[PDB]
Design a protein around this ligand. Structure first.
Ligand SMILES: [Cl-]
Ligand SMILES: [Cl-]
Ligand SMILES: [Cl-]
Ligand SMILES: [Cl-]
Ligand SMILES: [Cl-]
Ligand SMILES: [Cl-]
Ligand SMILES: [Cl-]
Ligand SMILES: [K+]
Ligand SMILES: [Mg+2]
Ligand SMILES: [Mg+2]
Ligand SMILES: [Mg+2]
Ligand SMILES: [Mg+2]
Ligand SMILES: [Mg+2]
Ligand SMILES: [Mg+2]
Ligand SMILES: [Mg+2]
Ligand SMILES: [Mg+2]
Ligand SMILES: [Mg+2]
Ligand SMILES: [Mg+2]
Ligand SMILES: [Mg+2]
Ligand SMILES: [Mg+2]
Ligand SMILES: [Mg+2]
Ligand SMILES: [Mg+2]
Ligand SMILES: [Mg+2]
Ligand SMILES: [Mg+2]
Ligand SMILES: [Mg+2]
Ligand SMILES: [Mg+2]
Ligand SMILES: [Mg+2]
Ligand SMILES: [Mg+2]
Ligand SMILES: [Mg+2]
Ligand SMILES: [Mg+2]
Ligand SMILES: [Mg+2]
Ligand SMILES: [Mg+2]
Ligand code: NA
Ligand code: NA
Ligand code: NA
Ligand code: NA
Ligand code: NA
Ligand code: NA
Ligand code: NA
Ligand code: NA
Ligand code: NA
Ligand code: NA
Ligand code: NA
Ligand code: NA
Ligand code: NA
Ligand code: NA
Ligand code: NA
Ligand code: NA
Ligand code: NA
Ligand code: NA
Ligand code: NA
Ligand code: NA
Ligand code: NA
Ligand code: NA
Lengths: 337, 156, 142, 132, 172
RNA sequence: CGCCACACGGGGUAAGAGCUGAACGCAUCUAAGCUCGAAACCCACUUGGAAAAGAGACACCGCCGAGGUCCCGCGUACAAG
RNA sequence: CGAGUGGCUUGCUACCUCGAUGUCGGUUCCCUCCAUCCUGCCCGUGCAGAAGCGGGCAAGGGUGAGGUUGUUCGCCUAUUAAAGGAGGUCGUGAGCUGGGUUUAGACCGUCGUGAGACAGGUCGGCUGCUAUCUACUGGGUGUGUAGGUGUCUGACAAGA
RNA sequence: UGUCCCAACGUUGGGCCCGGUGAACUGUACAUUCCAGUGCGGAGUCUGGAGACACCCAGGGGGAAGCGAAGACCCUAUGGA
RNA sequence: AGCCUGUGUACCAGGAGGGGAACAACCCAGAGAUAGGUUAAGGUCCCCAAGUGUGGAUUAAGUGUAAUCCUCUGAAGGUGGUCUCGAGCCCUAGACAGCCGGGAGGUGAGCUUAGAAGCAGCUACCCUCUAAGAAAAGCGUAACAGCUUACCGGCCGAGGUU
């Protein structure tokens, strides 16, 4: 009869090709609810350890009790909104209008950009306001970049640059909010955007694995029984029926696996601190020591240690926030042994 | 078996019993119904007219007639009316039931050849046309589309 | 941006096919055409069925592909492509010298071609390309 | 059912031979099915702690042998994870024959029982000698 | 064909394009009367529905436009009212108007409150076990009334036994 | 075999429940119009995506110099590339 | 009784291949159909409720594990929301398997004077090839758009 | 007891890159195809559409009714043994 | 049966060229080379040469835009979808429908039956008042009551019904 069975692997994360930017790019942003604010931040993955927590869930029969929870440590030092980009609404979607930059630049931002030497901030600002007057102003986002230098364990000094949306009350109000952030020096921090307890969406470029078989890549079976000894162990039965006489792209085949962007949904921010309270004895394997601004993320995060990961207020949360959870213990035990 | 296998008048006329044997008996019970003691001395005379030349197996004739006369008991087992099915299943029909080798079939039944426009049924009624209904049920069991034609009756 | 159209046609309340037919004829005669207010062009019939036809076209496909437009933009243009030997040198030239637009990006109001205008007063069974596109899932950028 | 209050890695399969932790007269039990469980092509139906399984008596009193009863998984060799992170495993795999209402067919439960089993099968629990 | 509707002294009816508006002491209602080759217009003291065709489909609409307009005259003067009656057998059903939508609570003991949104300038005045839906736009009232009765629809069980619910007692 | 994450809600519909309503003074869920209504459809969400031949946008840097390749030490990458 | 639709079965035909289109069952992996087994929304009821029975829309998802048999089918167990059916050269041997079918050996029964025969049964009995083209999975070099860096847009495409 | 649930990790030789050596199979022509249709009824080449910038590397083998063998089955021959 | 087997005939075979999307035998057409011209079949919105031709009508299903056909399906049965033509009857002495009013008494007929009163069954179905009104056509009740049909009048105003 041939029993039924779901297909192997999702056809939603394709094509399974190597990512274009190691730095993730959100294709979604939260809704314009609260007061004006930057809708995202970034850090650099460091590692894992567990934390003991007080059951924060009001519906848990264990609410108030001890509870061990896995946590991935992420160094989230301050970042810098170096300019405000404006978009206009056109018959072909949104298009970048202009940009308002600054003069105070991080000593090493030029390892990536051809830093500006002559820019007219006001004119840009004007152009934007005239577009808003005309009513063609599309959302507003800030060009942001990180300060790798600020993170010793991470070799790179060349900053990673990524655009982040600014959703606020009115457009006029948040437009201003934008300009103000920028004008200063763009300097902002995880505290300014997130609060321990809230849910965030963590994007990242997964750990690369090179070319792999379908078994690993799509999760197809290995030849079973007598079939496994005939000369085929990890190759599927066939590439398709006789007709249509062509191999469909839906059939699991070998290829690039890993080093793909993924936006993992609803990640609870256990704690946002600073210092070396989360670091492990011996140091974070293949990473280093943590002693500065950090975020503790519940569970796992895509990517290997040292990789840049991006945060964003969960766009589709299931639970209501349960602010500042009681941390009763953070394990610093060595990750070697 | 289906009417499809015998409803067309495409074969030769095959009726000479002097050369055909083992012909099954007709299922048609009667041809004259109602008050057959009386003669067509009725005010109204409706007829069921076949609209296409076809072959009707005795099967269909019986089923048609029954369904009509059985219904004409809206008038009663000894009601005042006379019903007549004027056609008889003369045409013997075969079936090749070896493959196409020596395929002249064996007698399996009979059918009546009616030509478009002939009346297959004629009923005689007093202004009490329940017969018109007896025929909407009758042509329901014969291949062709049919015309319910009223003759002596300008009592509309 | 900037299209020296020798002719600017206005599709508003005009029968797409009939317009498209005339635009191809001219583009083949060398004329540079631009169609305006595509979102407002119309096609007669029973909306329900009409939509079915187009939704099907969107769904038809495979590895080789069958790219079908959902914007009233594309829709109108592909319609015109069907009226030209778009694979022959001459036909690609003509097709290429034709462009459709959402609304009217010119100063001049385009012209309405003979026998392509539909009378809303004596016609209730018809559809707007834009309505179609909204149903297809297009993003109403107009 | 009700949350077990612990994450389980089924340690049993359809056809597994376990211990009958009670005085019903049934010594060895053979798993036949798992209540409320549907698997997936080629996968053997798996059972673990706190699962109500269908069983057949392999060993025991002639009168109890070959009988198809219903039971509950009181102990397993494969570890299970409690909320505080710790793991818990037992010395063997065991189940206690139960009836329609989930009341131990027997009178006394031999050997210990996971606590988690309590939160699901009261009458079984309230019959336990030792509850870890 | 052509029908002439003398408008009530109490009323004023204006119209531009395919949209007609009727205003009275009781309110103002605007509608679209759009059909192939049927022209509606306001000739001073009378509204005119005329068309050059006389086929069934057309006569159908002309006739429909007539009752539509006449109905509007009445809405802007006397108005429209539907009366309803709340009824329960075991659970005391609580019907309340909250905001722009009537809410029903404890229907058949349900914890979750059932609700529907009122249409237009429809007034739903509730007094005890009697409701009164009223307004100038017959279309809006009729629906709001209906919607209300519909709100207690039950498909799961025998209606003959479970009869709880609000119902239309009087139709204008 | 371990651990983390993977909605809701809008929009339009089918079957269906209705509203107003005429042909046909009445009646009528339909003929014109309207309100609802499926795990299905569209959006939402995730992934890819300037080779989209209408081959795109913005900011800055540069055209005797901006930037890049090779080179060297290595990998968060990798069968060559 | 009458009218049909489908192209799963069987039969018929002898159009296509005998300078060979590798025949069953199974397995693996992919897509599809709806005449819908479950799941969603509904109608009727000989609809109190609960459990059903029949019918409508509907193919998004699911439709599983085992005992005998090569078996398909089916018989049987226990689970299950349900453990639906069918198409893709009765999908799938340049993928597997080789139990069966179907060679050469042999036995039994039946038939035959005999050689030997039987869609009767039974034990044993082989699975070739370094991919030119095309197709697709992934990976690169170039050209076009017409100096560079960084950030984007989004026609369309995939998803359960 | 890794036959299976259900696969993982590791070892050795290959595989991949480089120097040297250096065949064979196969080839009417053309050839970037895909969906349909049609045709001696099983088409990369016909018809209609869709898609398609060129070249190259690796792969597992869907198709070329792939390559290999003038079918062993079946029938025919006033064939053979 | 794109089956088998006759027969007469034209065709393909062995027949180009034009049309038919493609296509031995369907349509035009039987053809020396070259050239001008006019037609045939078929076609005149575009692809694509020629009409977005004229008078008039129907269809709202994208029916259809499919001569022939393995190839283009669609049947019995059904349709107050819509258009056209006819016949009969009724009507400004006011029709058809709707709404209002009336639907009366002898009498709750006789008979049967505890009972029966229009209406369980059986028989009969008479006469008065009147502008109407059954010894009751349909519900309803244990039987009554109650609700309506028939029948009459009014309101309304034009065609209506078969
Ligand atoms: Cl296998
Ligand atoms: Cl596609
Ligand atoms: Cl072309
Ligand atoms: Cl219309
Ligand atoms: Cl099982
Ligand atoms: Cl000749
Ligand atoms: Cl169409
Ligand atoms: K052959
Ligand atoms: Mg082998
Ligand atoms: Mg460790
Ligand atoms: Mg340890
Ligand atoms: Mg299996
Ligand atoms: Mg029920
Ligand atoms: Mg082959
Ligand atoms: Mg169906
Ligand atoms: Mg599907
Ligand atoms: Mg096969
Ligand atoms: Mg199969
Ligand atoms: Mg092989
Ligand atoms: Mg193969
Ligand atoms: Mg091979
Ligand atoms: Mg064998
Ligand atoms: Mg064997
Ligand atoms: Mg054998
Ligand atoms: Mg082509
Ligand atoms: Mg041969
Ligand atoms: Mg032989
Ligand atoms: Mg011999
Ligand atoms: Mg010849
Ligand atoms: Mg032309
Ligand atoms: Mg059609
Ligand atoms: Mg025909
Ligand atoms: Na091998
Ligand atoms: Na091997
Ligand atoms: Na094959
Ligand atoms: Na024979
Ligand atoms: Na018939
Ligand atoms: Na159209
Ligand atoms: Na498509
Ligand atoms: Na919806
Ligand atoms: Na480009
Ligand atoms: Na058929
Ligand atoms: Na051959
Ligand atoms: Na097989
Ligand atoms: Na389905
Ligand atoms: Na079996
Ligand atoms: Na085959
Ligand atoms: Na093989
Ligand atoms: Na096989
Ligand atoms: Na092993
Ligand atoms: Na191949
Ligand atoms: Na000839
Ligand atoms: Na031709
Ligand atoms: Na069509």
């Amino acid at each position: 009869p041939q029993p039924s069975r779901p297909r192997k692997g999702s056809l939603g994360f394709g094509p399974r090709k190597r990512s274009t930017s190691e730095t993730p790019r959100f294709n979604s942003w939260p809704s314009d609810d609260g007061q004006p604010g930057v809708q995202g931040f970034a850090g650099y993955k460091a590692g894992m350890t567990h934390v003991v927590l007080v059951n924060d869930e009001p519906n848990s029969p264990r609410e108030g009790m001890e509870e061990t929870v896995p946590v991935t440590v992420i160094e989230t030092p301050p970042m810098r909104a170096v300019a405000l980009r404006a978009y206009e609404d056109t018959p072909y979607g949104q298009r970048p209008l202009t940009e308002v930059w600054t003069d105070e630049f991080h000593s090493e931002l030029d390892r990536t950009l051809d830093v500006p030497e002559d820019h007219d901030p006001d004119a840009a600002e004007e152009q934007i306001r005239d577009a808003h007057e005309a009513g063609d102003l599309g959302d507003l986002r800030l060009i942001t970049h990180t300060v790798p230098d600020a993170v010793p364990s991470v070799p790179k000094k060349k900053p990673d640059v990524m655009e982040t949306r600014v959703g606020g009350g009115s457009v006029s109000d948040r437009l201003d909010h934008a300009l103000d952030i920028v004008e200063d020096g763009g300097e902002h921090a995880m505290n300014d955007i997130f609060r321990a307890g809230e849910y965030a969406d963590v994007a990242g470029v997964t750990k690369g694995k090179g070319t792999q078989g379908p078994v690993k890549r799509w999760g197809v079976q290995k030849r079973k029984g007598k079939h496994a000894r005939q000369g085929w162990r990890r190759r599927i039965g066939n590439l398709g029926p006789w007709n249509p006489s062509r191999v469909r792209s839906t059939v699991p085949q070998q290829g690039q696996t890993g080093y793909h962007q993924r936006t993992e949904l609803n990640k609870r921010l256990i704690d946002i601190g600073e210092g070396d309270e989360p670091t492990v004895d011996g140091g974070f394997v293949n990473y280093g020591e943590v002693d500065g601004p950090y975020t503790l993320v519940k569970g796992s995060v895509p990517g290997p240690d040292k990789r840049l990961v991006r945060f964003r207020p969960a766009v589709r949360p299931n639970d209501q926030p349960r602010l500042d959870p009681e941390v009763r213990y953070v394990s610093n035990e060595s990750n070697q042994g | 078996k289906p009417g499809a296998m015998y409803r067309n008048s495409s074969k030769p006329a095959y009726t000479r019993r002097e050369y055909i044997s083992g012909i099954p008996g007709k299922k048609i019970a009667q041809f004259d119904m109602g008050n057959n003691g009386a003669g067509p001395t009725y005010p109204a005379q409706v007829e069921l007219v076949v609209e296409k030349p076809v072959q009707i197996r005795h099967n269909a004739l019986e089923a048609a007639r029954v369904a009509a006369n059985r219904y004409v008991q809206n008038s009663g087992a000894a009601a005042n009316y006379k019903f007549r099915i004027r056609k008889f299943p003369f045409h013997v029909i075969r079936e090749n039931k070896d493959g196409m080798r020596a395929p002249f079939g064996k007698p399996v039944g009979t059918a009546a050849r009616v030509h478009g426009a002939n009346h297959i049924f004629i009923a005689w009624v007093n202004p009490d046309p329940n017969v018109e209904e007896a025929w909407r049920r009758a042509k329901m069991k014969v291949t062709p589309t049919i015309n319910i034609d009223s003759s002596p009756a300008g009592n509309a | 941006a900037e299209f020296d159209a020798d002719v600017i046609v206005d599709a508003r309340d005009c029968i797409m096919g009939r317009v498209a037919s005339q635009v191809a004829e001219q583009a083949l005669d060398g004329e540079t055409v631009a169609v305006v207010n595509a979102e407002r062009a119309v096609i007669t019939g029973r909306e329900e069925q009409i939509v079915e036809k187009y939704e099907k076209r969107v769904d038809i496909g495979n590895d080789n592909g069958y790219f079908y437009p959902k914007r009233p933009d594309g829709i109108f243009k592909r319609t015109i492509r069907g009226m030209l030997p778009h694979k022959k040198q001459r036909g690609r030239e003509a097709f290429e010298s034709v462009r459709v637009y959402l609304g009217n990006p010119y100063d001049e109001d385009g012209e309405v071609l003979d026998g392509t205008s539909l009378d809303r007063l004596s016609n209730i069974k018809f559809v707007t390309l834009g309505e179609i596109s909204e149903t297809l899932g297009a993003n109403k950028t107009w | 059912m009700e949350a077990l209050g612990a994450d389980v890695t089924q340690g049993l399969e359809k056809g597994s031979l376990i211990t009958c932790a009670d005085n019903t007269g049934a010594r060895e039990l053979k798993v036949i099915s798992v209540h409320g469980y549907s698997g997936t092509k080629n996968r053997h139906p798996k059972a673990g702690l706190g699962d109500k399984i269908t069983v057949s008596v392999t060993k025991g009193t002639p009168e109890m042998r070959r009988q198809v009863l219903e039971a509950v998984v009181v102990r397993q060799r494969k570890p299970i994870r409690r909320p505080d992170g710790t793991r818990v495993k037992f010395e063997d795999n065991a189940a206690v024959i139960v009836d329609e209402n989930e009341d131990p067919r027997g009178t006394e439960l031999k050997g210990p029982i996971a606590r988690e089993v309590a939160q699901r099968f009261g009458s079984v629990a309230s019959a336990a000698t030792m509850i870890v | 064909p052509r029908v002439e509707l003398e408008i009530p002294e109490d009323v004023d009816a204006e119209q531009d394009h395919l949209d007609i508006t009727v205003e009275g002491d009781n309110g103002s209602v605007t509608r679209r009367l759009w059909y192939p080759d049927i022209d509606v217009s306001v000739d001073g003291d009378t509204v005119v529905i005329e068309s050059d065709e006389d086929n069934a489909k057309t006569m159908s609409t002309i006739g429909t436009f007539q009752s539509h307009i006449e109905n509007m005259f009445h809405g802007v003067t006397e108005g429209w009212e539907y009366g309803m009656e709340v009824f329960y057998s075991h659970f005391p059903m609580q019907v309340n108007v909250e905001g722009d939508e009537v809410v029903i609570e404890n229907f058949l003991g349900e914890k979750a409150p059932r609700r529907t949104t009122i249409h237009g300038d429809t007034d739903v005045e509730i007094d005890g076990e009697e409701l009164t839906v009223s307004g100038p736009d017959i279309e809006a009232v009729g629906q709001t009334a209906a919607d209300i009765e519909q709100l207690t629809r039950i498909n799961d069980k025998d209606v003959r036994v479970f009869q709880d619910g609000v119902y239309i007692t009087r139709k204008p």
